[PDB]
Amino acid sequence: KGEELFTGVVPILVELDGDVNGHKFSVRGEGEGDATNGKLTLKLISTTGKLPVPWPTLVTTLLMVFARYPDHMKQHDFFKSAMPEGYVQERTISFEDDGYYKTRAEVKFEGDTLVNRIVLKGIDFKEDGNILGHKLEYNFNPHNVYITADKQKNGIKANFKIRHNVEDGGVQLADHYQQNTPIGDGPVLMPDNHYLSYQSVLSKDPNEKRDHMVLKERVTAAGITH
């Protein structure tokens, strides 16, 4: 039922309101998602001028509903089953030897468009660290995100470490703890243990004047025998 909303290409709107060490910023993005092929593309633009944090640190915050679930794994796709009323996606992201983000997003249909509307707060960052000092490379590594059922809350949980490449070599770890809960009252799918395999490519639109990120992601569910 929820899954039937994703058989074709779905327009996406992303809106983020952010505040990191008191520096406020807003991002607005548009794009399209193709769950059949496990892919999405977004062009994300700062609407407040130069962003105060590196774009790669916002990649995970800025749509697991577009994962491709293989035919033998369809009964494990919580994310589409919560549609169209949607789900809340909440995270704490702890940056090693630095500050943390807290995010709350609602992912839901508004008419024909899938919207991801986020509030992000960042606390306790070092003015000289890799984040506020902009020392992270403009790229993104592949990661596996493990999904577990959270039956008591009718939702799912995930925790995973993101490795950000640092400009002069080295990595900056960002430890993510995530909880997703349905917005509606209707039944959702509680999944067996599996994971989502993510690939992400960051680029720039050479003709765009504003601070921005072009994000292309490929996401495939995996890990269930058969």
Residue numbers in the entry: 3 to 64, 68 to 231
From the paper:
We next targeted β-strand 7, the most structurally heterogeneous region of Aequorea victoria FPs (avFPs), to engineer variants with further enhanced stability. Introducing the S147P mutation that was reported to improve thermostability in violet-light excitable uvGFP21 yielded hyperfolder mutants with considerable resistance to 1 M sodium hydroxide (NaOH) solutions of pH ≥ 13 (we were able to determine hyperfolder FP extinction coefficients by collecting alkaline denaturation time-course data). hfYFP-S147P/V206K/L195M behaved as a stronger monomer in the OSER assay than did hfYFP; the L195M mutation originated de novo from a PCR error. We named the hfYFP-S147P/V206K/L195M variant ‘mhYFP’. mhYFP further demonstrates that diverse stability-enhancing characteristics can be structurally engineered into FPs with minimal perturbation to spectral properties. The V206K mutation (on β-strand 10) largely preserved the GdnHCl stability of multiple mutants. Using structure-guided engineering, we conferred the NaOH resistance that we first identified in FOLD6 into hfYFP and enhanced hfYFP’s monomericity in one step, producing mhYFP whose spectral properties are identical to hfYFP’s. We tested the same FPs that we compared in the other stability assays and found that none could tolerate OsO4 concentrations used for CLEM except mEos4b, hfYFP and mhYFP. We subjected eGFP, mGL and mhYFP to a modified electron microscopy fixation protocol (4% PFA and 0.2% Glut, followed by 1% OsO4 and embedding in agarose and optimal cutting temperature (OCT) compound—that is, polyvinyl alcohol and polyethylene glycol) and quantified the retained fluorescence.
We report the rational engineering of a remarkably stable yellow fluorescent protein (YFP), ‘hyperfolder YFP’ (hfYFP), that withstands chaotropic conditions that denature most biological structures within seconds, including superfolder green fluorescent protein (GFP). hfYFP contains no cysteines, is chloride insensitive and tolerates aldehyde and osmium tetroxide fixation better than common fluorescent proteins, enabling its use in expansion and electron microscopies. We solved the crystal structures of hfYFP (to 1.7-Å resolution), a monomeric variant, monomeric hyperfolder YFP (mhYFP) (1.6 Å), and a cysteine-free mGL variant called FOLD6 (1.2 Å), shedding light on structure–function relationships underpinning their brightness and stability. Through structure-guided engineering and screening based on GdnHCl unfolding kinetics and melting temperature (Tm) alongside rigorous spectroscopic characterization, we produced a series of avFP mutants demonstrating superior stability over sfGFP in diverse biochemical assays. Each FP crystallized as a monomer with no asymmetric unit.
